[PDB]
Amino acid sequence: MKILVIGAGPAGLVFASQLKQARPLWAIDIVEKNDEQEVLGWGVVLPGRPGQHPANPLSYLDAPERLNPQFLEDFKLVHHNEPSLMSTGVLLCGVERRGLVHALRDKCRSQGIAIRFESPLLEHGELPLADYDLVVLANGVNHKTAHFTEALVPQVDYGRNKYIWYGTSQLFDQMNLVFRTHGKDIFIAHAYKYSDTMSTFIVECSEETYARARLGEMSEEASAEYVAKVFQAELGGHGLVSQPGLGWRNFMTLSHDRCHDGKLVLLGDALQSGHFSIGHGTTMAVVVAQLLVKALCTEDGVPAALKRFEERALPLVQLFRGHADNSRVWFETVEEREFVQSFDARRKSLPPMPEALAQNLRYAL
Numbered sequence: 001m002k003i004l005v006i007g008a009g010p011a012g013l014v015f016a017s018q019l020k021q022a023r024p025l026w027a028i029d030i031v032e033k034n035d036e037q038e039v040l041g042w043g044v045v046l047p048g049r050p051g052q053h054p055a056n057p058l059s060y061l062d063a064p065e066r067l068n069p070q071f072l073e074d075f076k077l078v079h080h081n082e083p084s085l086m087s088t089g090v091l092l093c094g095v096e097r098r099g100l101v102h103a104l105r106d107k108c109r110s111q112g113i114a115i116r117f118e119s120p121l122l123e124h125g126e127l128p129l130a131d132y133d134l135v136v137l138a139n140g141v142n143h144k145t146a147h148f149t150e151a152l153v154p155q156v157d158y159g160r161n162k163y164i165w166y167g168t169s170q171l172f173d174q175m176n177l178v179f180r181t182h183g184k185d186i187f188i189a190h191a192y193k194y195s196d197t198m199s200t201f202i203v204e205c206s207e208e209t210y211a212r213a214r215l216g217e218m219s220e221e222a223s224a225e226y227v228a229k230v231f232q233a234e235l236g237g238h239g240l241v242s243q244p245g246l247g248w249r250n251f252m253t254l255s256h257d258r259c260h261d262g263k264l265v266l267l268g269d270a271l272q273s274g275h276f277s278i279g280h281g282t283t284m285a286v287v288v289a290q291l292l293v294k295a296l297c298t299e300d301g302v303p304a305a306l307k308r309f310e311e312r313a314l315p316l317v318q319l320f321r322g323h324a325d326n327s328r329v330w331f332e333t334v335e336e337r338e339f340v341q342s343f344d345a346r347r348k349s350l351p352p353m354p355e356a357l358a359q360n361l362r363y364a365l
């Protein structure tokens with residue numbers, strides 16, 4: 001069989017490797033838009049301990065300890081200049097995005113999966129459909145501007161508040177979202193350590209706040225220090241550094257009510273993206289990728305496999321979407337608000353994620 005994967009990110013890679021390992025003879029190639037050492041983002045939080053949790057991408061590496069994963073067991077919430085509590089959750093590990101993506105790429109190559117960098121695919125006329133049995137679209141949020149077919153156009157929902165992905169030397173040994181009211185403005189930060197020297201610092205605020213502080217009409221370094229000053233209490237004396245490709249923006253939720261179209265199948269953020277306020281994007285990429293692999297190893301043809309894939313994928317992506325919206329909305333509406341109670345039940349009466357992921361995991365694996 002011949003499979004083409006557009007996108008060398010978590011979803012694309014986890015699928016490639018998973019499938020190659022099970023079907024070595026199958027031909028699997030990947031095309032990446034960017035260069036080899038061009039990965040965006042700082043650090044991400046993942047479920048469980050590498051090697052012990054099937055949902056974590058680090059569990060598919062020959063040596064995950066190499067990336068120096070940071071294990072976080074506690075959660076600190078600062079509200080009104082006071083740590084409401086340290087309600088510990090479950091076991092989550094943080095690790096560098098770049099490092100993760102690079103490792104997964106080395107793994108695919110060591111398995112015989114070719115990856116052609118700096119080879120973006122945008123136009124539908126660029127799809128060598130007649131030369132492949134399956135085309136996997138795992139090109140992240142770029143899918144929005146490159147959907148290849150009207151029948152695969154996203155829903156696209158722009159988050160109400162602005163956010164930016166900062167990186168910092170301040171070590172947050174324990175996860176903690178902070179609410180700092182600086183003047184008439186409300187700033188929210190999501191921080192956690194992902195390495196021995198770096199922490200992720202996701203900051204967000206309303207459009208009004210973004211306009212008052214002129215975070216956009218200001219210099220990248222100038223905005224950072226400004227935000228760094230508002231949180232100097234939490235960051236100690238450490239500043240904030242942004243990436244040339246992140247910057248300020250509104251979260252785009254790419255939704256779908258269909259998983260495939262002929263030889264094309266969506267995967268990862270390209271299929272469904274969800275606000276980062278629940279940290280499941282990479283987990284979703286991994287679980288859904290496994291669903292496609294099982295379907296391909298059990299069904300006779302591609303069409304037959306896609307159909308069976310559809311069955312369990314959609315129900316899962318809708319649930320992820322459901323949780324992503326509740327959490328996102330909750331965060332967008334903080335100004336108009338035991339404060340540690342709402343945040344907890346913000347996911348309403350929706351079935352838990354860790355229960356749904358496992359259900360499909362035991363099935364695909």
Ligand SMILES: Cc1cc2nc3c(=O)[nH]c(=O)nc-3n(C[C@@H](O)[C@H](O)[C@@H](O)COP(=O)(O)OP(=O)(O)OC[C@H]3O[C@@H](n4cnc5c(N)ncnc54)[C@H](O)[C@@H]3O)c2cc1C
Binds near residue numbers: 276
């Ligand atoms: C602020 C923020 C914080 C987040 N924090 C977390 C977190 O802590 N935990 C978590 O799990 N996730 C987090 N995410 C989520 C996020 O990382 C995604 O869910 C992502 O990992 C999905 O993986 P992917 O491989 O599907 O996408 P991507 O990483 O976007 O990969 C897409 C790939 O396609 C390539 N490319 C894109 N367009 C094209 C094109 N048209 N054709 C060819 N190649 C193309 C890109 O270079 C990239 O290699 C965060 C996101 C943001 C925005």
